[PDB]
Amino acid sequence: YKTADFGIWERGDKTNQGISELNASSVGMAKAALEALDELDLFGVKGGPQSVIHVLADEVQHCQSILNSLLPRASTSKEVDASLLSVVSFPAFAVEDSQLVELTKQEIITKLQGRYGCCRFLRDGYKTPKEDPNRLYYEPAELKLFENIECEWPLFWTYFILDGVFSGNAEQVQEYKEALEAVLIKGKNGVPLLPELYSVPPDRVDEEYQNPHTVDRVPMGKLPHMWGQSLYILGSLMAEGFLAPGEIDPLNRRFSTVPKPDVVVQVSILAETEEIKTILKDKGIYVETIAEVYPIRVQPARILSHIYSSLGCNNRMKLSGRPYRHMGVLGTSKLYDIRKTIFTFTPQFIDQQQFYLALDNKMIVEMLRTDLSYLCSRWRMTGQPTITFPISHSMLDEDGTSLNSSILAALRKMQDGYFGGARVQTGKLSEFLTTSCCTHLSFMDPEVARYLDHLLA
Amino acid sequence: ALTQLIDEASEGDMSISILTQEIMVYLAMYMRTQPGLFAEMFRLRIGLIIQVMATELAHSLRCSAEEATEGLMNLSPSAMKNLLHHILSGKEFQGQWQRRRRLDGALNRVPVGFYQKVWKVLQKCHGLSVEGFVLPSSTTREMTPGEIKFSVHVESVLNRVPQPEYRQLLVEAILVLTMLADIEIHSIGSIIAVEKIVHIANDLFLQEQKTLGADDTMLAKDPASGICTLLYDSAPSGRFGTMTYLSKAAATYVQEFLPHSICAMQ
Amino acid sequence: QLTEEQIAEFKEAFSLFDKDGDGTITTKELGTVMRSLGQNPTEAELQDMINEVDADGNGTIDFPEFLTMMARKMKDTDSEEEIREAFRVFDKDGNGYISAAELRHVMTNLGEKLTDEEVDEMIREADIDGDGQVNYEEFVQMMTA
Amino acid sequence: SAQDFYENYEPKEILGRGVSSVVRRCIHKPTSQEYAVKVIDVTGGGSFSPEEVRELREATLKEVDILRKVSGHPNIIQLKDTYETNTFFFLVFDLMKRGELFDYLTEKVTLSEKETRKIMRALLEVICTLHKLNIVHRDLKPENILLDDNMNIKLTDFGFSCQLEPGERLREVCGTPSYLAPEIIECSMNEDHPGYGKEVDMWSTGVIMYTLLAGSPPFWHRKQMLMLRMIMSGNYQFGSPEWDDYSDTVKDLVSRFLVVQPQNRYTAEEALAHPFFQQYLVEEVRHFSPRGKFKVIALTVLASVRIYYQYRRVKPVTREIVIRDPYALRPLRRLIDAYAFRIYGHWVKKGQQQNRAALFENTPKAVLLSL
Ligand SMILES: C/C=C(\C)CC/C=C(\C)CCC=C(C)C
């Protein structure tokens, strides 16, 4: 989601100059895989804790946010790419809002569809007659020569078959099937072969400039195109009732676009010291000290990030595990069981060592508001998120005998049930043990391990 | 790479780098909360955001630029957030519009479709030059109206003027050119100098106010650009507004290049 | 300040304009009227004409917009020209006297069937100076009244 | 309780913001019907002292009352039900997909005569209902006016309203400065004036007329008290070139609401009786004396002749008239205003230092800098 890549068409941006860009298809497929590989035992039913592939939903939701910002655009340099058909419906199912799905789909069929297939993107010029077949890159002025003459791949009409059969909107499956069967070329003993691309004849280029998507196109490029052939055969198998949506998608990615209700956030407001607990008690709030939370142990998000660096570490393969990355609200909203000990990690927005934004109590209230709202909008687990919020001396007043007015108001809002667009069910951390996403960190069981067993002992 | 780029752009100015990353975070959850605060602003210039921050914290609680930065780097993070919200949404705590054009041409804010409207006008011309820096229609055929590279080219032509306010005056002149081109059937077929359009608008403003009784003291030129400070403080619309004088000079300039003109559809 | 009467006069005028009881006067309808009164402009002209009055209205005039026009927005010169024009519209003869028959000529044109004596009466009611003729001076005096 | 709130509605997205109140869209689970919820922070982030915390509740408890007293009426929102907590006060009402009239007046700088007529036809008919029930608003600003997808007016924020006891006249100053009637300030600057009654709403409505049809408040200037002397004295002008292209029936009705003396103000019932809001009912006999018939046929002729004459008069846009005076003629002036609000439509906000008149300069700089 934060890395730029050459993308599905191995060319980066529209200029085709080796400039990698954040194309939406890569991020969406990344989200689809990450949502696919979560808590998935990778020997299958004959498996155990050692084969669970662990995916942090923080990166998944960042991917979703970046697609939401991107869609219907595929990249900053491209207003829309047909490769978003690999993201909106299938295989990815990486977009949860159906409105964006249809908006992208009509943008595509309006701007990129022709009568021989869908162009990859505007000003593509991958195999147009107005391109030198030797120079791998494109000059900037050369891009304008590809307008209205881009090559149309029938590959993506098979994609429109796939999304049509997955959705169950038969018209589409009929109209686009008759669209695709008229561009298939027969081969061998008469078998349909789908050309990779239909190219403009060099003499009809001007006519298509004046009237786009009107000329007869010739089959050019790789034939048969086994990506397009595979998608066409999959669609034809389903379309005639030999395959089912469940068979192709056991994980049920086809239910990403269905509505999902918001969740009730559990919050365990904690007190660093007994005197902090007494000050908050005088204000009519019921909180438990971080010492009374024992045997449940509370740690900052940096400790969770260090712990999560020990996944997939295999010395002979010379893999050091996950790189040190910040844990968002979701990673810190789940109760982790490590070495049979329940562990609740505080959200990173209260960390004052990394930055001073957590030294400002109004900023504390503001980013708690933002995190709670976003996590309510983006929780996709089993159970209920649980944020442990410890009250420190920095969250008191300058006098030291009173909690800050902003934090007092915020805590009262969470106790009453509403704060910042979120429904908060406050309570003790012990009560939320059975009503949360209890993820067992199986990778640690026989650096950070020494720190952990020091805390446990 | 991001941290190294920020530090290198700081050029040893640690304070501007740390304020830069903090303002990046603020811009980030402002995107996540209120995307509409950035519809007019396509390039997010955190350094110029800090500079405008200091300028606005100087205009209120009147003090020097050094004292402005000293105060700026002193407030609480929530104060950074609310002040940035003020500068972005347009909330207000030389003159009113002179502080509304110094805050509009320094962040390089242009109305929605400005980069999409320059494209249409350039097809009726040969180029758009600001301070002798042309933006020809070859760019329009090169890059689409909605292309980000087109916005980059237009702002590169529009950022050739160092000061903020006369840049927004140039933007207003460009847009009155757009509207007059919509009215005008014919095309100029040549280069139009937006800077000289604003200069002729300033001359017309001077003449009209001098006839109506304005003294030389009020009719005072800006030291660098040469546009009168009152014209900077003048309201955009109105009988004597900036966008009426720019609509007055976007016609007398087209006079020499276009000997005969036909205006239709009102 | 337009009296219940005046508003009512504007309303019946709006009625004379629309044959259909549409509640609106179309570019075509105005036209039927102008041609009824003999000065028949182009269909385009009409479109512009209905546009000058409304600006949205899709080529149809409304009573709030028609009163809006019939209220004396007119400048003395502007009205004068108009007052004069109607008067001419009144006299095909252009003799300069308003024939009883002529009033009939106009009504017949506007498709309203009204009694012959009544017509004489209409002039007579309003006629002192021109026995049988409304002089222009009478017309102007009358309009203001 | 908050459970009662979420048992019936689910807030999806943030619609608008306020000083301490937040407007949020919701879905009514039993009905799946769009509804707006205003979410007032009672504690206000801790800035509110216990007095303001109490006062905001009493203001809110009162606020339910007026919105309870008026219901089923076409052009004011229906408070479907109200939920109160120790820290918030939720109020669920109708969803208006479009924003306030201020946002609309920003998009279209000068609002056309036909459009404003039904806009205020509702507003005056709104005003009749309030006055017949004897409830004054004191807050009739266009930001207080909400519009739906059919442009229908939904008067909102009766936050400053209070029910007059029969024959009682208030003294508290409630309202942002521009839209305050002359005796509002006079009662603020004197004790002899025993108060202002329900005629207050008439002045505020007449102010919308000048704002909607011209894009500026009737009286506006950047310092605070100077606006006030323009209000109590009552110095307004249908200035040129702006205000000359509208029909004369507009001007008189504007003055009627804008008379400085309250008793001579144009109350809501007779306000709808002014010639502007007269409607063409098809089925009217409309009998007339023979002089009355003769006028109609003459007026019918005079109207056709008029329309041809008025149109012939409109001057096509030429190069020279643009050079001499753009603002003088309508098509170019409305354009300059339109592209005025596209560039600096973000500068116009609620208050005094952000009004729309800041975007108009109708006077020479010398007369502006005279004092
Ligand atoms: C109707 C406007 C006029 C007399 C003023 C002169 C207009 C122009 C000089 C050129 C601006 C844009 C052109 C796009 C093609």
Residue numbers in the entry:
A (entry chain E): 176 to 621, 659 to 669
B (entry chain E): 875 to 967, 1051 to 1223
C (entry chain H): 4 to 148
D (entry chain G): 12 to 382
Sentences copied from the publication:
We determine a high-resolution cryo-electron microscopy (cryo-EM) structure of human muscle PhK in the inactive state, which elucidates the architecture and subunit organization of the PhK hexadecamer. The structure of the human muscle PhK in its inactive state, prepared in the presence of the chelating agent ethylene glycol-bis(β-aminoethylether)-tetraacetic acid (EGTA), was determined using the single-particle cryo-EM method, with an overall resolution of 2.9 Å. The density of one half of the complex is superior to that of the other half. Consistent with previous observations, the PhK complex exhibits a butterfly-like structure, with a central body consisting of the β4 homotetramer and four wings comprised of the αγδ heterotrimers. The α-subunit interacts with both the β- and γ-subunits to anchor the αγδ subcomplexes onto the main β4 body. The γ-subunit is attached to the α-subunit; and contrary to previous models, the β- and γ-subunits do not make contact with each other. The β4 homotetramer is a dimer of dimers, with each β-subunit interacting with two other molecules. Indeed, mass spectrometry analyses suggest that Cys1220α and Cys1090β in the human muscle PhK are also farnesylated. The farnesyl groups on Cys1090β are buried in the larger dimer interface and glue two D5β domains together; whereas the farnesyl group on Cys1220α is involved in interacting with the γ-subunit. Mutating Cys1090β, but not Cys1220α, to Ala leads to a shift of the PhK holoenzyme to a lower molecular weight position on size-exclusion chromatography, suggesting that the farnesyl groups on Cys1090β play critical roles in maintaining the structural integrity of the β4 homotetramer and, consequently, the PhK α4β4γ4δ4 hexadecamer.
Phosphorylase kinase (PhK) phosphorylates GP and transforms it from the inactive b form to the active a form to initiate this important biochemical process. The 1.3-megadalton PhK α4β4γ4δ4 hexadecamer consists of a tetramer of tetramer, wherein four αβγδ modules are connected by the central β4 scaffold. The α-subunit serves as a bridge between the β-subunit and the γδ subcomplex, and facilitates the γ-subunit to adopt an autoinhibited state. The γ-subunit bears the catalytic activity and consists of an N-terminal kinase domain (KD) and a C-terminal regulatory domain (CRD).
